[PDB]
Swiss-Prot record:
Interval of the full protein contained in this chain: 78 to 187 of 375
Protein name: Protein DEK
Tissue specificity: Ubiquitous. Expressed at relatively high levels.
Domain (SAP) ranges: 72-106
Compartment list: Nucleus
Residue numbers of Phosphoserine PTMs: 44-45, 82
Domain of life: Eukaryota
The protein's assembly and partners: Found in a mRNA splicing-dependent exon junction complex (EJC) with DEK, RBM8A, RNPS1, SRRM1 and ALYREF/THOC4. Interacts with histones H2A, H2B, H3, H4, acetylated histone H4, non-phosphorylated DAXX and HDAC2. Component of the B-WICH complex, at least composed of SMARCA5/SNF2H, BAZ1B/WSTF, SF3B1, DEK, MYO1C, ERCC6, MYBBP1A and DDX21. Binds DNA.
Function description: Involved in chromatin organization.
Disease: A chromosomal aberration involving DEK is found in a subset of acute myeloid leukemia (AML); also known as acute non-lymphocytic leukemia. Translocation t(6;9)(p23;q34) with NUP214/CAN. It results in the formation of a DEK-NUP214 fusion gene.
Modification after translation (UniProt): Phosphorylated by CK2. Phosphorylation fluctuates during the cell cycle with a moderate peak during G(1) phase, and weakens the binding of DEK to DNA.
Length: 110
């Protein structure tokens, strides 16, 4: 495969974030790959795809950066439910801390 070949540390490099993700679950893969990759991740995909989606550790302060803040907000409640369950987190902090985490994590995990 070759979904990542330049990102300093894509979802597959960051051992911390890449690790918690190695424990993907059928249900989790259902929502994560259904919207993130818009595809029914299988075995070699859900594994590589998740670790290699697009490039979480990208750049912020850009038109898209703010964009995520919104979509990740509504998802903050739902997405974190499943995502947080397996996204290097333990479900904690307040709403403002959850979304703020998507801009500091989904926009720059590491």
């Amino acid at each position: 495969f070759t979904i990542a070949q330049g990102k300093g540390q894509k979802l597959c490099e960051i051992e911390r974030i890449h690790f918690f993700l190695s424990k993907k679950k059928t249900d989790e893969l259902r929502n994560l790959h259904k919207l993130l990759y818009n595809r029914p991740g299988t075995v070699s995909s859900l594994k590589k795809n998740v670790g290699q989606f697009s490039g979480f550790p990208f750049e912020k302060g850009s038109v898209q950066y703010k964009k995520k803040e919104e979509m990740l907000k509504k998802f903050r409640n739902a997405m974190l439910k499943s995502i947080c369950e397996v996204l290097d987190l333990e479900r904690s902090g307040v709403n403002s801390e959850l979304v703020k985490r998507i801009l500091n994590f989904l926009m720059h995990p590491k």
